[PDB]
């Protein structure tokens, strides 16, 4: 803090377009003739945008005196994140979160004669497990020199207001960072190819395309909220069900404005041609083809583990250091429905899911695996099964039944692949599942 | 780690003159004969001055033990600032002090013929401004190893007294530094030649010189306190008046010791020979010929901005750090009377003052300037005026009238120069002002 | 205890300081080499043997 700034013009970062002063002066029947009768239109023109640096100016009457500052104003701002309503509870102690899902079973036929030797036969349930771990640890650092900051203020109220604004800046930064972190999750999920993809033409090309997108969204929501459920909209391929009141559609402002200008302001019975679930508007996604994302309330699995503030004082320098530490867990659940609604170029098959992903079997035994292909078209894609564990005597039938030999003891990997490319241009989509064996 | 000393003799800090120990051993009829009947005079002469380092002294009863300390005494002193009575108040918020002084005007000749056209004429008042700023920021640092010092003191009271002594030493340092800064103010003011110089002889050279100095001071005080005022005693050449109760005279101890033993004891009616105003004694000044200073109570303009103390603890080193921060603004007012009685050779002209320090004129106006030359002797000197603006058309006449050309845009400086040297080595004293140009 | 940093620091400081001092002082005086271990240094020992 040293006041040495001499000969600074009030034109630092300004690149004028047409020099309003000359435009007004050389006006003969132009649009600027309105400003001709103004007595002082040059000082206003040259000062009305504000000046970044001020200099001491003497008084008009007595040049010994200096003009002084009459008013000082301090601006305040408060920023929030509209996704905060998606946050889950709090986990003070712990690092990981465990998620368990149980699936439906199969029906057998009643046979009393065969029931007299299979009373104690057992049939294990179908259970799937998912894990999440804490993945964000950060802090914000600020310093305040209260004693050295007293020469710039005349009123204790203004001094306190400035200090309060400095403190609030940390919270604003934390809110912005939290919003960015939460919005990165959808882009990461789309980049991993775990969304269920619905192909649309374009939300902006034509009103017909926009209304086709609306129709597709309504059909998808109706299919999602069915009492019997469906294993077609979750990455784990489990028979699950969703409720209409828990469905959230995230779109952007351009799409919202185009929709309510084109299809809502010109349609009678507007309730039959609009969105169904809860509607959220953000500032667009980072993905190329993403237009609108339809998710379940339980899709978000974000938790906060630490939120604390610590202050230290320097006696030699007379200043306070403030540290704001934030620790969080950011992840999403694969047991909930999630639709992407892509409008660009989409491959024929997005992923292949093998229903048993981890399984432990004995030295000699058979295990059945099922595969689901997420195709974006109505075409049927065949699935090729293989196992590569490096052991001789184990083999997988084309139906996905793997029989393991007891001669060797090592981990096995099971692959179900499809070919979505053309001849001489093999494009492969592979779904992997690992098998352990007990000796 | 163990601070120890070996092979130490009690003569490192003693410079013997005649070795009284040996002198009193062999004396016949001398003045030392009074000390011969003393039995243990050798020990008294040996350790009369004290011992700097406590050697391990064996006990008399048993020579295989250690000796304790009979008594520990803590010496405490307090140092004050004799000039503290000249302090002004405190400035919690702000950095700058503005001082405004309005001067007298000139009488005009009555005329009714010219009163018909100049009824709405303007006559700007003569005002002057002075500025002071916060210019001292310092701190005192002291470390105390309380855990390392408790084990070295038998009693808790001794340790408490030691800590109190350290704090008192910090405060004494602050007081001494403040006194030195206040003296440095006067030394700097004399260095810049802003005092009103008065030539005297050396007061201690002779009683005639002492009484001449007394007469000169009394005359100067009367002139300063004259009711009509004068502009020959202040650095801004402004018409001002002083009161006898606000005049402070600063001298040294030698002059005070000389006066009362030379003139005050010899002569009756001590009020007709002693000093007039308030008199304070210091340990001289740093200047070469400066002998006395007579200033007004408002001459000092020292204010306090900050005074605080902070402490920190080091767990690893087991000590406390104390920081004592003092922030002050130190300045003097040029509107107050300030004369300096100096003995020796002084220049004929000390400074030249231009009455309008800053002026603002248009491209057709004229400005009148007044010059005041501070001359020690009664010799008359002639001033020469010049303008260092750098442009043409703008010029100043010999009587101090500056005229500005019709077209000119740069900052002008008006200089008044006095030549006091001789040929082949001219000596110039110049006073200048600043002029700004309106469009 | 963990509601805020001030209480956390106060609790941890008091606990570690007082409990550690007391416990270590009472457990270091029961070591096998305790018969050579005397208490605090006596006042006025005079560091001299008679």
3-state secondary structure chain B: CCCCCCCCCCCCCCCCCCCHHHHCCCCCCCHHHHHCCCCCHHHHHHCCCCCCCCCCCCCCCCCCCCCCCCCCCCCCCCCCCCCHHHCCCECCCCCEEEEEEECCCCCCCCCCCHHHCCCCCCCCCCEEEEEEECCEEEEEEEEECHHHHHCCCCCHHHHHHHHHHHHHHHHHHHHHHHHHHHHHHHHHHHHCCCCEEEEECCCCCCHHHHHHHHHHHHHHHHHHCCCCCECCCCCCCCCECCCHHHEEEEEEHHHHHHHHHHHHCCCCCHHHCCCCCEEEEECCCCCCCEEEEEEEHHHECCEEEEEEEEEEEECCCCEEEEEEEEEEECCECCCCCEEEEEECCCCCEEEEEECCCEEEECCCCEEECCEEEEECCCCCCCCEEEECCCCCCCEECCCCEEECCCCCCCCEEEEEEEECCECCECCEEEEEEEEEECC
Beta strands in A242-302 (DSSP E): 247-252, 278-282, 293-296
- Whether the Cβ atoms of residue B79 and residue B172 lie closer than 8 Å to each other: yes
Contacts of C5 in chain A (CB under 8 A): 308-310
Instruction: Count the Cβ atoms, other than its own, within 10 Å of residue B416.
Output: 23
- Whether the Cβ atoms of residue B346 and residue B289 lie closer than 8 Å to each other: yes
CA–CA separation, B415 and B12 (whole Å): 64
CA–CA separation, B162 and B143 (whole Å): 13
Q: How far is CA A204 from CA A187, A274, B4, in A?
A: 21, 16, 91
Phi, psi (rounded to 5 degrees) for B385: -100, 150
Q: Quick one: which H or E segment has residue A368?
A: strand A365-368
Structure tokens at B237: 């050449």
Structure tokens at B264: 């005050």
C5, A310: Cβ pair inside 8 Å? yes
CA–CA separation, A46 and A60 (whole Å): 19
Planar angle of CA A85, A89, A92, nearest 5 degrees:
140
Q: Quick one: which H or E segment has residue A175?
A: helix A156-191
CA–CA separation, A196 and A205 (whole Å): 23
How would you list the strands of the sheet with A247-252, edge to edge? A278-282, A247-252, A293-296, A338-339
CA–CA separation, B249 and B295 (whole Å): 7
Please count the residues of chain A.
Answer: 439
CA A213 to chain centre: 22
Contacts of A308 in chain C (CB under 8 A): 5
Nearest to B87 by CA among B223, B202, B179: B179
What are the residues whose beta carbons fall under 8 Å from the beta carbon of A128, sequence distance 6 or more? A100, A101, A103, A236, A238, A335, A357
- Whether the Cβ atoms of residue A335 and residue A238 lie closer than 8 Å to each other: yes
- Whether the Cβ atoms of residue B68 and residue C44 lie closer than 8 Å to each other: yes
- Whether the Cβ atoms of residue B144 and residue B163 lie closer than 8 Å to each other: yes
Structure tokens at A167: 């403190």
Write down the residue that tokens 């080595």 correspond to: B425
Nearest to B348 by CA among B283, B429, B250: B429
Nearest to B72 by CA among B13, B157, B8: B157
A297, with CB counted inside 10 A (0-12, 13-18, 19+), is: middle
The DSSP letter of residue C42 is P
Structure tokens at A316: 């030699």
Planar angle of CA B413, B414, B420, nearest 5 degrees:
125
| C45 Cα to chain A: minimum distance (Å) | 42
Contacts of C16 in chain B (CB under 8 A): none
Planar angle of CA B410, B413, B419, nearest 5 degrees:
150
- Whether the Cβ atoms of residue B97 and residue B90 lie closer than 8 Å to each other: no
A64, B94: Cβ pair inside 8 Å? no
CA–CA separation, B408 and B401 (whole Å): 17
In this complex, the residue of A63, A156, A315 whose CB is nearest that of residue B360 is A63
B93, A315: Cβ pair inside 8 Å? no
Phi, psi (rounded to 5 degrees) for B90: -130, 145
A92, C5: Cβ pair inside 8 Å? no
| C43 Cα to chain B: minimum distance (Å) | 8
Exposure string for A370-379, b = 16+ CB within 10 A, e = fewer: ebbbbbeeee
CA–CA separation, B285 and B290 (whole Å): 7
Please count the residues of chain B.
Answer: 439
Instruction: Count the Cβ atoms, other than its own, within 10 Å of residue B170.
Output: 17
Planar angle of CA B101, B102, B104, nearest 5 degrees:
140
Strand partners, B382: none
CA–CA separation, B273 and B301 (whole Å): 32
Contacts of A305 in chain C (CB under 8 A): none
CA–CA separation, A93 and A111 (whole Å): 53
The resolution of the experimental structure, rounded to one decimal in Å, is: 3.0
Please count the residues of chain C.
Answer: 50
| C14 Cα to chain B: minimum distance (Å) | 15
What are the residues whose beta carbons fall under 8 Å from the beta carbon of B177, sequence distance 6 or more? B138, B326
Q: Is A384 helix (H, G, I), strand (E, B) or coil?
A: strand
Planar angle of CA A208, A214, A216, nearest 5 degrees:
100
Q: Quick one: which H or E segment has residue A136?
A: strand A136-144
CA B369 to chain centre: 33
Cα nearest neighbour of A58 on chain B: B360
CA–CA separation, A364 and B346 (whole Å): 119
CA–CA separation, B181 and B174 (whole Å): 11
Exposure string for B240-262, b = 16+ CB within 10 A, e = fewer: bebeeebbbbbbbeebeebbeeb
Beta strands in chain C (DSSP E): none
CA–CA separation, B259 and B270 (whole Å): 11
Q: Quick one: which H or E segment has residue A432?
A: strand A428-437
A210, with CB counted inside 10 A (0-12, 13-18, 19+), is: buried
The conformational region for residue A252 under phi > 0 = left, psi -120 to 50 = alpha, else beta, is: beta
In this complex, the residue of B64, B67, B154 whose CB is nearest that of residue C43 is B154
| C9 Cα to chain A: minimum distance (Å) | 11
| C45 Cα to chain B: minimum distance (Å) | 7
> Is the four-CA dihedral B181, B243, B371, B344 of positive or negative sign?
negative
- Whether the Cβ atoms of residue B302 and residue B124 lie closer than 8 Å to each other: no
Contacts of A318 in chain B (CB under 8 A): 310, 325
Angle between helices A253-262 and A207-224 (to 10 degrees): 110
In this complex, the residue of C43, C45, C49 whose CB is nearest that of residue B64 is C49
Rounded to a whole number of angstroms, the CA Rg of chain A reads: 33
B405, with CB counted inside 10 A (0-12, 13-18, 19+), is: middle
CA–CA separation, A235 and A374 (whole Å): 9
| A231 Cα to chain C: minimum distance (Å) | 44
Structure tokens at A158: 């203004």
Q: Is A186 helix (H, G, I), strand (E, B) or coil?
A: helix
A309, C2: Cβ pair inside 8 Å? no
In this complex, the residue of A64, A151, A153 whose CB is nearest that of residue B127 is A64
B263, with CB counted inside 10 A (0-12, 13-18, 19+), is: middle
Q: Is A237 helix (H, G, I), strand (E, B) or coil?
A: coil
Contacts of B355 in chain A (CB under 8 A): none
The conformational region for residue B248 under phi > 0 = left, psi -120 to 50 = alpha, else beta, is: beta
Cα nearest neighbour of B152 on chain C: C43
Phi, psi (rounded to 5 degrees) for B164: -60, -35
C5, A308: Cβ pair inside 8 Å? yes
Q: How far is CA B383 from CA B235, B355, B404, B416, B420, in A?
A: 18, 14, 21, 6, 11
What are the residues whose beta carbons fall under 8 Å from the beta carbon of B183, sequence distance 6 or more? B83, B282, B285, B286
What is the rounded (10 degree) CA torsion for A157, A159, A163, A168? 50
Please count the CA atoms within 13 angstroms of the CA of A130 that sit on its side-chain side: 14
Contacts of B310 in chain A (CB under 8 A): 315, 318
The DSSP letter of residue A246 is G
What are the residues whose beta carbons fall under 8 Å from the beta carbon of A163, sequence distance 6 or more? A144, A146
Nearest to B233 by CA among B339, B313, B329: B339
A310, C2: Cβ pair inside 8 Å? no
Per DSSP, chain C holds a count of helices (H) and strands (E) of: 2, 0
**Solving technique:** cryo-EM
Interface A–C counts its CB contacts (< 8 A) at 4
Instruction: Count the Cβ atoms, other than its own, within 10 Å of residue B220.
Output: 21
B396, with CB counted inside 10 A (0-12, 13-18, 19+), is: buried
The conformational region for residue B390 under phi > 0 = left, psi -120 to 50 = alpha, else beta, is: left
Q: Quick one: which H or E segment has residue A310?
A: strand A303-314
CA–CA separation, A237 and A231 (whole Å): 5
C5, A309: Cβ pair inside 8 Å? yes
What is the rounded (10 degree) CA torsion for A46, A51, A55, A61? 40
Phi, psi (rounded to 5 degrees) for A398: -60, -20
- Whether the Cβ atoms of residue B311 and residue B136 lie closer than 8 Å to each other: no
Instruction: Count the Cβ atoms, other than its own, within 10 Å of residue B302.
Output: 21
Nearest to A308 by CA among A291, A289, A288, A328: A328
Structure tokens at B289: 């010929």
CA–CA separation, A333 and A128 (whole Å): 12
Contacts of B306 in chain A (CB under 8 A): 147
| B57 Cα to chain C: minimum distance (Å) | 11
- Whether the Cβ atoms of residue B415 and residue B386 lie closer than 8 Å to each other: yes
Per DSSP, chain A holds a count of helices (H) and strands (E) of: 5, 18
Q: Which chains touch C (3 or more CB pairs under 8 A)?
A: A, B
Strands A319-329 and A136-144: antiparallel
> Is the four-CA dihedral C2, C7, C8, C14 of positive or negative sign?
negative
CA–CA separation, A155 and A167 (whole Å): 19
């Amino acid at each position: 803090m040293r006041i040495t700034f001499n000969d600074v013009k009030t034109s630092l970062g300004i690149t004028e377009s047409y020099d309003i002063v000359n435009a007004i002066r050389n006006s003969q029947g132009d649009n600027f003739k309105s400003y001709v009768p103004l007595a002082t239109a040059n000082n206003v023109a040259e000062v009305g945008a504000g000046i970044l640096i001020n200099q001491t100016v003497q008084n008009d009457f007595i040049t010994s005196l200096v003009d002084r500052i009459g008013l000082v104003v301090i601006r305040q701002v408060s920023l929030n994140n509209p996704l905060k309503k998606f946050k889950k509870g709090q986990i003070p102690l712990g690092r990981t979160i465990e998620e368990i899902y149980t699936d439906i079973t199969k029906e057998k036929q009643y046979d009393a004669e065969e029931a007299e030797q299979k009373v104690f036969e057992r049939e294990m349930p179908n259970v799937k497990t998912l894990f999440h771990e804490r993945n964000r640890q950060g802090f914000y650092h600020q310093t305040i020199q209260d004693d050295s900051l007293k020469t710039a203020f005349v009123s204790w109220g203004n001094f306190e207001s400035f200090v309060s604004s400095i403190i609030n800046a940390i919270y604003n930064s934390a809110e912005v960072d939290e919003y960015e972190y939460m919005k990165l999750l959808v882009d990461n999920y789309y980049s991993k190819g775990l969304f269920t993809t619905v192909k649309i033409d374009e939300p902006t090309s034509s009103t017909g395309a926009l209304t086709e997108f609306v129709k597709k969204m309504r059909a998808t929501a109706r299919k999602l909220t069915l009492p019997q459920g469906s294993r077609d909209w979750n990455s784990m391929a489990v028979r699950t069900r969703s409720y209409m009141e828990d469905l959230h559609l995230i779109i952007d402002a351009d799409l919202e404005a185009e929709l309510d200008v084109d299809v809502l302001a010109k349609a009678f019975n507007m309730n039959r041609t609009d969105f169904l679930g809860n509607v959220t508007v953000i500032d667009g996604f980072a993905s190329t083809g993403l237009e609108a994302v339809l998710v379940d309330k339980d899709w978000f699995m974000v938790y906060d583990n630490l939120h604390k503030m610590e202050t230290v004082r320097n006696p030699r320098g007379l200043y306070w250091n403030y540290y704001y530490h934030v620790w969080q867990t950011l992840s999403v659940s694969r047991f909930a429905n999630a639709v992407a609604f892509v409008s660009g170029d989409v491959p024929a098959v997005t992923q292949v899911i093998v229903s048993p992903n981890i399984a432990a079997v004995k030295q000699g035994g058979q295990q059945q695996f099922t595969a689901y292909v997420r195709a974006t078209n109505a075409k049927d894609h065949k699935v090729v099964w293989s196992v590569e564990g490096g052991s001789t005597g184990t083999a997988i039938t084309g139906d996905g039944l793997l029989s393991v030999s007891g001669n060797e003891d090592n981990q096995l990997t099971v692959k179900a692949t499809v070919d979505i490319g053309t001849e001489d241009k093999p494009k492969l989509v592979v779904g992997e599942a690992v098998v352990s064996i007990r000796p």
